[model samples]
Target: EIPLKYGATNEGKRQDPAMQKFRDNRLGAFIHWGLYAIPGGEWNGKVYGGAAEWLKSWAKVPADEWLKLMDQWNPTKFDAKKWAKMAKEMGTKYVKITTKHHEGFCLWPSKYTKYTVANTPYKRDILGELVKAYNDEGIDVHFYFSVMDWSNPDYRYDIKSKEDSIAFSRFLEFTDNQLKELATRYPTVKDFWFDGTWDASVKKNGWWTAHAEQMLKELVPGVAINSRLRADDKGKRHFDSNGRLMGDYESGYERRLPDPVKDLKVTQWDWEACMTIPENQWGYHKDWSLSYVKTPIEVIDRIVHAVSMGGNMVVNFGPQADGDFRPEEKAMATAIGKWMNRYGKAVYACDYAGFEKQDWGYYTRGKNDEVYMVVFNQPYSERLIVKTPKGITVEKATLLTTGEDITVVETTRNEYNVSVPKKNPGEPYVIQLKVRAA
Candidate 1:
């Protein structure tokens, strides 16, 4: 019943050149900032026991009532340079900013809605500033757009009858207009990661989803749209009804990744894994007392884990209301920067692990054909058993941190138990395998 264009072939390799850009951009930073940050998981002096990003839903706040926090939404201290610098220092190649969330407050001024930054006391285009600054710093800017607009009057969970289509049709037109403005205004956006489109209304209106995606491609010419935007021929969004994928890359594996050995199928598919520093809070919550956060070592390990599986890992950063990151986040960012400063060679352009089973931490490759064995859980025993294919020999093994000689011994063609000192390296130590690939 909806008019839209369908691809001649709905499966297999995506011919768009954008996929090449995405493959090269293996690391990115995700910023979940919004008016919700003002309340920071609190409602009427009570802390909502949920994600700060979902404060509007958990607190049972009406659209207008929740948006009232915008009056105090002045991020007077926010500096785009500082934020972009943190991402750059973390070795991220792209940044995804939340342009609109479930609460429906647009970061940029939109004519279609009153609930936006233009209505706020601090009427400035925050997203625009970030896009300009980050792009100037040589980092691509990707926008996270939420299709579920809580503030819109036309938002419907159920359509009772044909009459419901009349109102919904108007809503669809408004939504399309807004998206057109965004695509035209921010033509340089590298990707559109749509979220919050799972309502029944969206399912019934699947043709509009495909239309929006096509319009974006026509406007931006190489911008990637997430799977959340389109329902496949089988009526699913990310995955088709026939179990096919719908997006340029799978958005599954958030906060987790495939076990390299067990999930070989994952490598065959394009995917990204996004993780948070604090356990579950994606928005700035101002309360660390509620949950235990990850340390720098843990975050870096997860980042390395994604790259080792030939997938991109996106780390989330939720800045506080005052436009400053918590001290913990600042320290974590700097710590990650320090590690990347020394060993980015093993991360950027890295391939999947070569071994069948991994007793060590992780494995990453270099563009120059060098392989790195990141041994996180150093065994208490004297020897490390490395299982590689037959007819290949380790030319040399050296500690990654200090570049000191690590004792190497070959036990077999495919398996070799390398010897190390009795004293464990202070943290997860790494050994670089200098090999002549057979």
Candidate 2:
């Protein structure tokens, strides 16, 4: 491995109390609202099929005109308390709000930028209201900041010349000042999720990325930062030059997740996967008919899937231009809340059980000696096959929701056929087990 500064701080997963809280709080919800919500994926009355947040780029609209959306940035129905209640009911332990998106619109009144809510008709600090409201409901708040500012004159896609390099340098400092402001203004923020850094300019100036990380940590002690936020001295982002993770937790799993079986290496460190309800839209789109939407059950399955693999999952919510969430998102939250209320014990504080994946479903081990079998697919034969590791044996099984004991019949030295619930659960259910290893 090449010797370098700004590499990974450690070699393995963090065991600190704050990091543990970040890991144990497995379910998160994302609030992606911005100026793009005003247009809702359209430009010049021509509807675009691309992401609403990237509508500026999709339509090739200049920064001046795109920022003009700020003129109509009135969310009459935006109630911070209502949003907090919605997230709490969705069983989200944390909420990731887009403090600023790629469009360069700030939700708060930042002195560094004139393109902010203070300059709009809705002059109140949207982010401040959200931070307080979410925290009031016992939900941790995380900031989602985009470093690639389209409205900034110094912002460079790639430093191609002396002039470009000088301009980009100033842009990086501007980015730094904004970050300082964020950390100073919202001290309650638990983490910072950086986005829009896939360009060459960001990778080239990796030192700035590292500085940002260290700067925030100094300001916000125990504050978690995502791996994708920086690069090493060698311009290696996420995992550093020697493949060591840079940030506190891996954040490269956007809109995707690692294989539960094939990618067990992911469990070696703390990671999170953020997914959109629609296939590709993270920002509000007036018409969701442009893409396929995930049902609540599918969302729940993914949430359990992440927890079962020792990872966290964040589901995205794109509030409409009116500041209220879409109907589908509200219903999705209610549905997830119903299921989570019934079986959250199986999800919270649960880690990888180290048992082989079963056809019936996933296995998550709690902080205690208990293991949960979150069955997604119920077999008609009513036999859930459980294959234990060497020297391990299943003692008994109990349904999580109903507390009814389930029968387990040992078919081999380290394998058993646990009985499926006699009564159909009508949806996914968890069966807790007491196991022993001699």
Candidate 3:
């Protein structure tokens, strides 16, 4: 491997208690709130059905024009406590809030910037309120920071000249100061998920990326960092030139997931997958009709799929400008919460079962060495096939919800057939299996 001062700090998955908790808290929620929410995908009487958060860019609105929305950023209905309670009811163990997006609007009042919540109509530290409320309810908080700032004149897309380099350097320091403020103010932050780092300027200065990661660790020990935040000496992001993961967890999987059987390499390390409820709306869009919305059941499948593959899944929610959630988002959270309340054992603290993927659904292994089959598509024949590792035989099968025994037949060597629940359960159900290996 090439000698390098700034590369991957850790080679494999971190085994520390903090990282274990990060991984064990499989399901999380994403809060994508910012100044862009005010427009909500509409610009000057014209509706752009793109991602609401990027509405400013899509409309080519000047930064000065966009920052004017700060005066209108009064979230009268936004209650930090109510938001935390909603996350609790949704069964999320943690929440990843966008402290600052690419638009450079800080949710917290940072001393380095005049454009922050302190100067907005709603003169309150939204980030602080959320951290306290989530922690009060026993939930971890993660910070989502965007490195590229559009509001800053010093910001550069690429460092092509000496002047460009000088300006970008100042911009990096400003970004660093904002980050330091976040770390200092919200000491309860458990992780930092960086976004908007795909610009050429960020890639050219990989040293700053490494420095920012180390800086946060110095301030908040045991705080996890995502792979998206790191770049090596050679401008390689996520993974180092030596092909090793740079951060504590991989975060490249956004709005999509890996194939369980084909992409087993992700199981080797920590990773997270986040998806928007609609086709591409991460921020609050006034009209969801323009895009396809995923039902709670479909969302549940993605959540289970991620956990089953040894990854964390964060469902995104874009609160409206009024600080209240859209009806669809509220209903989605409630539906998912109801499902989790009934069968959360298969998700919380569960790891990949390492079994071959089956047609019925996914499999999750709990901490107690119990395997659960989250069946999404019930087999038409009513018999769920099971092919376990060699020498392992199904000892007993039980319905997780009803707590009743299920018929387990050892049809052949190292193979068994588990009978589907008699009533079908009317939705996706889980079957807990007790197995023994010779």
Candidate 4:
């Protein structure tokens, strides 16, 4: 309902190098860790079936009562190196971790709030470890922060009263202090993925949101913040109703992907889509039996679907309360990592092919004139039919997994039906085409 252009413009974006990197890294992983991970949807020993990220809400735990969970926050097995290794193996170019959530638990030691990891047995800075480990592995790291802390006394749900001015202001200052600490502590962080900014308090006090963006840009050079963190959008959180983006990127597509036909309507904005292994869980839930969990193949398909629509896909991983990934999570990571090992060239640092949907699969592109044809649905007709787009001549086609030359031809106006490989290559066969402007 509101226009996003009054105070926000993409004109200033080009000057930031970090923004460039953010765009370049088209694939990432989102880790939503907090007090919810400990409970994993079990409240008072009864597991309620819901998204683990919303565990606090499901349990109806108050701020003071929830903060007491800190006594159980001891991650003895959290090895940052191992986490980064898993991310790298999965072919994720970056990782965005939730430094705080709706529950208001900080993974880092922040002076602004007592509800931090430092107050718990795991006194180490989890965000700091992730930054160092991810950066060490040459992967970009981003922080996911929730503006509305359900665990904070100052947090108001909607329609702030007169007293809300003083209370909410303190929360804003608390947010600013923690954010500054994060920005300074982890110098290598490339971006901030803001969440929980949809509350009325944030929208009404939009100036603070804007102020945080400006201050973050100044404090952490090249750091990018998502539009969801701010509320200048005609009173909306992320994008203006006029179709203009308000932040560095649009970030509302969680657990949902873009439909090619539907998403094409959106224009002039960068977007990232986050998906959970389960139907809704973002935090590590102990009992996945109660949820419709997606397999590795399902997750891979979603990633291809989103990336084909010019949106980045970030799979979610919810580590256990003990700082160790669950068996299912580790297996998913390894399985996805194995696939990305051979087919990632078509994903990482790649862009959507201008090609429309084909029965074969999705199309992605890389630098130096290489078009990646991601074939998902296997052809039972003994041939993979690919109708190449016009204005581009295929120089050569080769399978990424086997590096075998694929037969190509110009059948129609820039259309090519590649011959079926002599032998079938298993799972999401990527065909690489070297070409230039026709």
Candidate 5:
């Protein structure tokens, strides 16, 4: 391993109270809103079904041309309180908002750049209102920032010359200023979800990355930085040269999840996975008719899957340009909210239960060692097979939502067959179990 000065300062995952809160709040919502939402995947009369936020790149529109959308940027229906309420109804413990995306448009009024909400017709500190509204609703707020600024000439993809290095250094300083501004402005922000750091320019400047993390922590006590923003002295991302995670939590799981059995190693560390509602649309698109949107049940399954594997899941929500959520997303949030309202014990404050994987569903352990069997795929056998670790005995099983007793037949040592409710739940449900070592 290459020796480095800017490698991970700690040995393993952080054990601070802030990190604990993050772990407890397993379900979150990721909101991606920007100038791109105005065009919304269509440019020059052709609809692009790709990720809506990347429309600038897809259409090959110049930065000046893309910035022109700002003149028309007015979300008449944008309501911070309403957005917070919808998130509350969705049962999300936290919300991640984009302070800025690759387009370099600052959602907040940043003194570091003119490309901000202050310059737009909707000249309001959008991020400030969001932070206050979400916090008022008792939900934590995390900010997503992109380091690569397409609108900045100093932004370099790679540094091949002395001039490139100098300009990139200035760019890093500018990035630091913006981050400092954000930390001072929104001190309540808990985490920083960074993107646009995949280029060689960022990799070569690993020292700056380490410095930035340290700077943010100093600016805001207990601020959690995503692993994607870090790079060791050797340009290794996520993990350092010594094979240890570099940030407060692992953030490599984007739009995908870890294997329940095969990827159990993730249980040894803290990580988060984000997913899009549709196949590929982070920002609002005028036409989702091209992609297959996920049903609320499907979203619920993903959330359960994440919690059961000792990780967090953040579902994406892209509101329309006018600030109203599309019907499909609103319905999805409502459906998931209903399920969460009924059986949130299986998600929030839950962790990976040390149990064998079953075909019926996943297993999550509550704070009190209560095992939750989130039944996604109900078995036709009318029984959910539960295998406990050695010396652990199942005391009793009951429906989490109804508190009705479920029959448990001991088939072998540390193993039992739990019978499902006679009447199917008609949707995803939870089965709570009382277990103890005997």
Candidate 6:
């Protein structure tokens, strides 16, 4: 490996009390709200079929023109308490809010920037209300911050000249102040989910990235930073030159999942996967019909798949500019809530169990030695094949929702043919298992 001054602080995942909270909270809600939600993929009487958040770039709207969306900013239906209630019902332990997106619109009032809620007609600190409301419901809050600010004049794509370097330095100081303000203002925030760091300017300034991480940790003890924020001295991102994760947890899985079998290496360290309901819309779009939308069952399967691999999954929710969720999103949340209400025991506080991949579904282990067989595909023979690790024997099996016993027959030395219930479960279900050494 090439020599580097700034590398990963630890060779592996940090094992601490705060890190445990992040790991145990297997499910999270990702919120993408900004000025782009106002246009929501339409510009100049034409609709664009790209990520709604990137509509500004797609339409090639000047920064001054995009900032005008602030004048029309209003969310009459926005109620922090109601949002928190919905999140609780959805059984999410934490919520990740976009304090600022690439568009550079600030949800909170920032003294350092005029392009914030403070100057908007609404003039309300949207982020402050959310943090308090979510915390009141006993849910942890994380901030989603973007480093590439299109609205900032000092922001540069790459430092090519002496003047460019001077201006970028000022921008870095501005970013530092904003981050420090966020840390001091919302002291309860548990994590920072950074994005827009893949630009050439950020990659060249690896020292600032390391300083930002250390600065936040000093301001707020135990604050978690995602891997997306760091770059080594050689401009290597995520994993350092030595192949070690730089932040508290990996944040490389965006809008996709790791291969359950080939990507088993992800199980070794803490990582998270954020996915969009539609194909690629992270912000609210005027028309979801323009693209294929994922069903509630599909969303649930992704959540389970992540947890089964010892990682957390955050499903994205893009609320309308008026702060009301679209009908499809509301339905998706309710449907997922129904499944979580019944089988949440299989998701919460669970990790990957040492079980081989099977056609049935995934396997997750509870805090104790309890194993859960999350059945997604019921075979035609009505038998779920379960292969335990060597020296382990299946003690018993039961439905997690009803606690009803399930028949188990030893098909081989380390395999068992577990029978599904005579009546089909209308949706995905979980079966709890008790296992022990032979």
lDDT of 1 by residue, 192-275 (tens): 888888887888777777788888888998888777777744355676655656667777787777887788776655677899
Prediction-by-prediction clash tally: 0, 0, 0, 1, 0, 0
The parts of candidate 1 lying over 4 Å away from their true place are: 1-17, 390-393, 419-425, 436-438
After superposition on all C-alphas, the RMSD of every candidate to the true structure, in Å, is 3.0, 0.9, 0.9, 2.3, 1.0, 1.1
Candidate with more favorable, higher TM-score: 1 or 6:
6
- lDDT value for model 2: 0.91
Name the better of 4 and 5 by lDDT. 5
TM-score of each: 0.91, 0.99, 0.99, 0.93, 0.98, 0.98
What is the per-residue lDDT of model 6 for residues 381-419, given as tens digits with 9 covering 90 to 100? 989999888999988889877778899999988999989
**Stretches of candidate 2 exceeding 4 Å from the true structure:** none
lDDT of each: 0.80, 0.91, 0.93, 0.80, 0.92, 0.92
Show the colliding residue pairs in model 3: none
Where does model 4 exceed 4 Å of error? 1-6, 11-16, 265-267, 436-438
Error of 5 at 288 (Å): 0.9
Better candidate number, 1 or 4, judged by TM-score:
4
